[PDB]
Enzyme design. Sequence first.
Site, PDB file in Angstrom:
ATOM      1  N   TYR A   1      -3.737   2.120  -9.536  1.00  0.00           N
ATOM      2  CA  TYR A   1      -3.071   3.072  -8.654  1.00  0.00           C
ATOM      3  C   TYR A   1      -1.659   2.628  -8.245  1.00  0.00           C
ATOM      4  O   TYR A   1      -0.679   3.070  -8.845  1.00  0.00           O
ATOM      5  CB  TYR A   1      -3.931   3.342  -7.415  1.00  0.00           C
TER       6      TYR A   1
ATOM      7  N   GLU B   1       0.810   5.520   0.469  1.00  0.00           N
ATOM      8  CA  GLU B   1       0.190   6.828   0.699  1.00  0.00           C
ATOM      9  C   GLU B   1       0.914   7.774  -0.219  1.00  0.00           C
ATOM     10  O   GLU B   1       2.110   7.606  -0.462  1.00  0.00           O
ATOM     11  CB  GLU B   1       0.281   7.268   2.160  1.00  0.00           C
ATOM     12  N   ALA B   2       0.188   8.738  -0.775  1.00  0.00           N
ATOM     13  CA  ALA B   2       0.764   9.605  -1.788  1.00  0.00           C
ATOM     14  C   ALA B   2       0.138  10.992  -1.771  1.00  0.00           C
ATOM     15  O   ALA B   2      -0.783  11.268  -1.008  1.00  0.00           O
ATOM     16  CB  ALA B   2       0.602   8.972  -3.160  1.00  0.00           C
TER      17      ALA B   2
ATOM     18  N   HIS C   1      -5.638   5.019   5.894  1.00  0.00           N
ATOM     19  CA  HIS C   1      -4.715   5.874   5.142  1.00  0.00           C
ATOM     20  C   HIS C   1      -3.355   6.066   5.831  1.00  0.00           C
ATOM     21  O   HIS C   1      -2.598   6.988   5.509  1.00  0.00           O
ATOM     22  CB  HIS C   1      -5.377   7.217   4.834  1.00  0.00           C
TER      23      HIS C   1
ATOM     24  N   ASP D   1       0.840  -1.199   0.000  1.00  0.00           N
ATOM     25  CA  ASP D   1       0.000   0.000   0.000  1.00  0.00           C
ATOM     26  C   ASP D   1       0.874   1.248   0.000  1.00  0.00           C
ATOM     27  O   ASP D   1       1.918   1.304   0.662  1.00  0.00           O
ATOM     28  CB  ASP D   1      -0.940   0.013   1.197  1.00  0.00           C
TER      29      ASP D   1
ATOM     30  N   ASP E   1      -3.425   0.070   6.253  1.00  0.00           N
ATOM     31  CA  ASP E   1      -4.232  -0.374   5.122  1.00  0.00           C
ATOM     32  C   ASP E   1      -3.674  -1.642   4.474  1.00  0.00           C
ATOM     33  O   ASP E   1      -4.416  -2.385   3.847  1.00  0.00           O
ATOM     34  CB  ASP E   1      -4.362   0.754   4.102  1.00  0.00           C
TER      35      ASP E   1
HETATM   36 MG   LIG Z   1      -4.346   2.062  -1.138  1.00  0.00          MG
HETATM   37 MG   LIG Z   2      -3.879   3.669   2.236  1.00  0.00          MG
END
Ligand SMILES: [Mg+2]
Ligand SMILES: [Mg+2]
Length: 224
Positions: A121, A15-16, A181, A13, A186
Amino acid sequence: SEPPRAETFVFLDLEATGLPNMDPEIAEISLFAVHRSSLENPERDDSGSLVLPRVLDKLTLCMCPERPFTAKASEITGLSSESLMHCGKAGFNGAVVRTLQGFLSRQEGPICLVAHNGFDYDFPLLCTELQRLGAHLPQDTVCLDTLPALRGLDRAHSHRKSYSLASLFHRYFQAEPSAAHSAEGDVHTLLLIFLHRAPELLAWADEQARSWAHIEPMYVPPDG
DNA sequence: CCAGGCCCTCTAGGGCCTT
Ligand SMILES: [Mg+2]
Ligand SMILES: [Mg+2]
Ligand code: NA
Protein backbone atom coordinates in the site's frame (compact mmCIF):
# COMPACT_ATOMS: atom_id res chain seq x y z
CA SER A 1 30.18 -2.22 -1.54
CA GLU A 2 27.89 -1.83 1.47
CA PRO A 3 26.22 1.29 2.89
CA PRO A 4 26.24 1.54 6.69
CA ARG A 5 23.18 0.22 8.53
CA ALA A 6 20.16 2.53 8.59
CA GLU A 7 20.57 5.32 11.16
CA THR A 8 17.09 6.88 11.10
CA PHE A 9 13.80 5.02 10.88
CA VAL A 10 11.03 7.10 9.36
CA PHE A 11 7.62 5.76 10.26
CA LEU A 12 5.04 6.48 7.60
CA ASP A 13 1.27 6.38 7.17
CA LEU A 14 -1.02 7.59 4.40
CA GLU A 15 -4.70 8.39 4.44
CA ALA A 16 -6.08 8.17 0.93
CA THR A 17 -9.15 8.11 -1.27
CA GLY A 18 -9.55 4.33 -1.21
CA LEU A 19 -7.97 0.91 -1.67
CA PRO A 20 -5.62 0.03 -4.57
CA ASN A 21 -8.47 -1.18 -6.76
CA MET A 22 -9.58 2.40 -7.49
CA ASP A 23 -6.13 3.99 -8.00
CA PRO A 24 -6.19 5.91 -4.72
CA GLU A 25 -4.56 9.28 -4.04
CA ILE A 26 -2.85 10.53 -0.89
CA ALA A 27 -4.96 12.94 1.20
CA GLU A 28 -2.77 12.94 4.30
CA ILE A 29 0.80 11.82 4.97
CA SER A 30 2.43 11.67 8.37
CA LEU A 31 6.07 10.84 9.11
CA PHE A 32 7.75 10.31 12.50
CA ALA A 33 11.54 10.21 12.20
CA VAL A 34 13.34 8.31 14.96
CA HIS A 35 17.09 7.80 15.32
CA ARG A 36 18.21 4.21 15.68
CA SER A 37 19.57 4.83 19.19
CA SER A 38 16.04 5.53 20.42
CA LEU A 39 14.97 2.13 19.09
CA GLU A 40 17.87 0.04 20.36
CA ASN A 41 16.98 0.93 23.95
CA PRO A 42 13.36 2.18 23.96
CA GLU A 43 12.77 5.08 26.34
CA ARG A 44 10.20 4.28 29.06
CA ASP A 45 8.59 6.48 31.72
CA ASP A 46 8.89 5.76 35.43
CA SER A 47 5.90 3.40 35.28
CA GLY A 48 7.71 1.28 32.67
CA SER A 49 5.47 2.34 29.77
CA LEU A 50 6.84 3.21 26.34
CA VAL A 51 7.10 6.91 25.53
CA LEU A 52 7.66 8.63 22.22
CA PRO A 53 11.40 9.29 21.68
CA ARG A 54 12.26 12.81 22.87
CA VAL A 55 14.28 13.69 19.78
CA LEU A 56 11.60 13.13 17.17
CA ASP A 57 11.09 14.91 13.88
CA LYS A 58 7.53 14.99 12.57
CA LEU A 59 5.80 15.99 9.35
CA THR A 60 2.08 15.86 8.64
CA LEU A 61 0.66 17.27 5.40
CA CYS A 62 -2.93 17.25 4.15
CA MET A 63 -3.58 17.50 0.42
CA CYS A 64 -6.54 17.55 -1.94
CA PRO A 65 -6.79 14.53 -4.29
CA GLU A 66 -7.49 15.08 -8.01
CA ARG A 67 -10.26 12.47 -8.00
CA PRO A 68 -13.00 11.76 -5.43
CA PHE A 69 -12.88 9.81 -2.20
CA THR A 70 -14.88 6.62 -1.99
CA ALA A 71 -17.64 7.02 0.60
CA LYS A 72 -15.97 4.53 2.92
CA ALA A 73 -12.61 6.31 2.71
CA SER A 74 -14.13 9.71 3.47
CA GLU A 75 -16.00 8.14 6.39
CA ILE A 76 -13.05 6.46 8.09
CA THR A 77 -10.59 9.32 7.44
CA GLY A 78 -12.89 12.25 8.26
CA LEU A 79 -11.56 13.86 5.09
CA SER A 80 -13.28 14.97 1.88
CA SER A 81 -12.26 16.83 -1.27
CA GLU A 82 -14.46 19.74 -0.24
CA SER A 83 -13.00 20.01 3.27
CA LEU A 84 -9.43 19.86 1.95
CA MET A 85 -10.18 22.50 -0.70
CA HIS A 86 -11.96 24.63 1.89
CA CYS A 87 -8.82 24.53 4.05
CA GLY A 88 -6.78 25.66 1.04
CA LYS A 89 -4.82 22.46 0.42
CA ALA A 90 -3.39 21.85 -3.04
CA GLY A 91 -2.72 18.36 -4.41
CA PHE A 92 0.43 16.28 -4.13
CA ASN A 93 2.76 18.83 -5.73
CA GLY A 94 6.28 20.25 -5.82
CA ALA A 95 5.76 21.86 -2.42
CA VAL A 96 4.99 18.45 -0.89
CA VAL A 97 8.08 17.05 -2.59
CA ARG A 98 10.35 19.86 -1.41
CA THR A 99 8.99 19.67 2.12
CA LEU A 100 9.42 15.89 2.18
CA GLN A 101 12.91 16.02 0.70
CA GLY A 102 13.98 18.69 3.19
CA PHE A 103 12.53 16.65 6.03
CA LEU A 104 14.38 13.49 4.99
CA SER A 105 17.61 15.44 4.50
CA ARG A 106 17.30 16.45 8.19
CA GLN A 107 17.73 12.77 9.12
CA GLU A 108 21.02 10.97 9.60
CA GLY A 109 21.10 8.41 6.81
CA PRO A 110 20.70 5.89 5.52
CA ILE A 111 16.95 6.08 6.09
CA CYS A 112 14.65 3.11 6.60
CA LEU A 113 11.00 3.90 5.82
CA VAL A 114 8.53 1.91 7.94
CA ALA A 115 4.86 1.33 7.10
CA HIS A 116 2.31 -1.31 7.96
CA ASN A 117 1.50 -3.31 4.83
CA GLY A 118 3.83 -0.79 3.19
CA PHE A 119 4.94 -3.20 0.47
CA ASP A 120 1.34 -3.49 -0.75
CA TYR A 121 0.00 0.00 0.00
CA ASP A 122 1.99 3.01 1.29
CA PHE A 123 5.26 2.45 -0.56
CA PRO A 124 3.77 1.81 -4.03
CA LEU A 125 1.27 4.67 -3.54
CA LEU A 126 3.97 7.12 -2.42
CA CYS A 127 6.10 5.89 -5.33
CA THR A 128 3.28 6.67 -7.77
CA GLU A 129 2.81 10.19 -6.38
CA LEU A 130 6.54 10.96 -6.38
CA GLN A 131 6.99 9.47 -9.85
CA ARG A 132 4.28 11.72 -11.27
CA LEU A 133 6.49 14.65 -10.29
CA GLY A 134 9.77 13.00 -11.26
CA ALA A 135 10.86 13.13 -7.62
CA HIS A 136 13.38 10.82 -5.95
CA LEU A 137 14.38 9.80 -2.46
CA PRO A 138 18.00 9.26 -1.40
CA GLN A 139 19.54 6.26 -3.17
CA ASP A 140 20.42 4.36 0.01
CA THR A 141 16.86 4.62 1.33
CA VAL A 142 15.43 1.24 2.33
CA CYS A 143 11.97 0.00 3.30
CA LEU A 144 10.57 -2.11 6.12
CA ASP A 145 7.03 -3.51 6.12
CA THR A 146 6.07 -4.41 9.67
CA LEU A 147 3.40 -6.85 8.45
CA PRO A 148 5.58 -9.58 6.90
CA ALA A 149 8.31 -8.68 9.42
CA LEU A 150 6.19 -9.43 12.48
CA ARG A 151 4.70 -12.51 10.78
CA GLY A 152 8.20 -13.81 10.00
CA LEU A 153 9.53 -13.05 13.47
CA ASP A 154 6.59 -14.91 15.01
CA ARG A 155 7.09 -17.85 12.64
CA ALA A 156 10.75 -17.95 13.70
CA HIS A 157 9.47 -19.25 17.06
CA SER A 158 6.56 -21.51 16.11
CA HIS A 159 6.82 -25.26 16.75
CA ARG A 160 -4.93 -17.70 12.18
CA LYS A 161 -3.70 -14.70 14.17
CA SER A 162 -4.54 -11.21 12.88
CA TYR A 163 -1.68 -8.89 11.95
CA SER A 164 -3.81 -5.82 11.32
CA LEU A 165 -2.49 -2.68 12.99
CA ALA A 166 -5.42 -2.66 15.43
CA SER A 167 -5.10 -6.34 16.38
CA LEU A 168 -1.36 -5.97 16.95
CA PHE A 169 -1.81 -2.95 19.22
CA HIS A 170 -4.52 -4.80 21.14
CA ARG A 171 -2.35 -7.91 21.46
CA TYR A 172 0.78 -6.09 22.61
CA PHE A 173 -0.70 -3.37 24.83
CA GLN A 174 -4.05 -4.91 25.85
CA ALA A 175 -5.88 -1.68 25.08
CA GLU A 176 -7.32 0.13 22.07
CA PRO A 177 -5.36 2.84 20.25
CA SER A 178 -6.60 6.38 19.54
CA ALA A 179 -7.36 8.39 16.39
CA ALA A 180 -7.71 5.49 13.96
CA HIS A 181 -7.31 6.46 10.29
CA SER A 182 -5.74 9.75 11.19
CA ALA A 183 -2.30 9.49 9.61
CA GLU A 184 -0.59 10.87 12.69
CA GLY A 185 -2.62 8.62 15.00
CA ASP A 186 -1.76 5.48 13.03
CA VAL A 187 1.95 6.36 12.74
CA HIS A 188 1.91 6.74 16.51
CA THR A 189 0.27 3.32 16.87
CA LEU A 190 2.80 1.81 14.45
CA LEU A 191 5.77 3.31 16.32
CA LEU A 192 4.53 1.89 19.61
CA ILE A 193 4.10 -1.53 18.01
CA PHE A 194 7.64 -1.30 16.59
CA LEU A 195 9.09 -0.23 19.94
CA HIS A 196 7.48 -3.25 21.58
CA ARG A 197 9.61 -5.55 19.37
CA ALA A 198 12.41 -3.11 18.54
CA PRO A 199 15.52 -5.31 18.72
CA GLU A 200 13.85 -8.01 16.60
CA LEU A 201 12.53 -5.53 14.05
CA LEU A 202 15.88 -3.71 13.83
CA ALA A 203 17.58 -7.03 13.12
CA TRP A 204 14.94 -7.79 10.49
CA ALA A 205 15.40 -4.39 8.85
CA ASP A 206 19.19 -4.74 8.82
CA GLU A 207 18.88 -8.07 7.02
CA GLN A 208 15.79 -7.71 4.81
CA ALA A 209 14.74 -4.08 4.30
CA ARG A 210 14.10 -3.52 0.58
CA SER A 211 15.75 -0.79 -1.46
CA TRP A 212 13.37 2.09 -2.17
CA ALA A 213 14.64 1.88 -5.76
CA HIS A 214 12.96 -1.54 -6.09
CA ILE A 215 9.56 -0.16 -5.14
CA GLU A 216 7.27 0.00 -8.17
CA PRO A 217 4.37 2.45 -8.60
CA MET A 218 0.93 1.22 -7.55
CA TYR A 219 -0.42 2.60 -10.81
CA VAL A 220 0.75 4.87 -13.62
CA PRO A 221 -0.43 8.41 -12.88
CA PRO A 222 -2.43 10.20 -15.59
CA ASP A 223 -1.07 13.37 -17.19
CA GLY A 224 -2.39 16.93 -17.02
C1' DC B 1 -16.55 0.64 -11.13
C1' DC B 2 -14.06 -3.67 -8.48
C1' DA B 3 -5.78 -4.75 -6.45
C1' DG B 4 -2.40 -8.35 -5.53
C1' DG B 5 1.37 -10.56 -2.90
C1' DC B 6 1.04 -13.27 0.84
C1' DC B 7 -0.32 -17.20 3.76
C1' DC B 8 -2.70 -21.36 5.06
C1' DT B 9 -6.18 -24.87 4.19
C1' DC B 10 -7.57 -31.08 1.38
C1' DT B 11 -3.11 -28.11 -4.74
C1' DA B 12 -6.61 -24.26 -6.19
C1' DG B 13 -9.38 -21.59 -3.54
C1' DG B 14 -10.00 -18.08 -0.28
C1' DG B 15 -9.15 -14.47 3.15
C1' DC B 16 -5.98 -11.06 4.79
C1' DC B 17 -4.22 -6.21 4.79
C1' DT B 18 -3.98 -1.30 3.27
C1' DT B 19 -8.38 3.37 2.57
MG1 LIG C 1 -1.97 2.65 6.94
MG1 LIG D 1 -4.18 5.15 8.70
NA1 NA E 1 -3.28 12.94 11.42
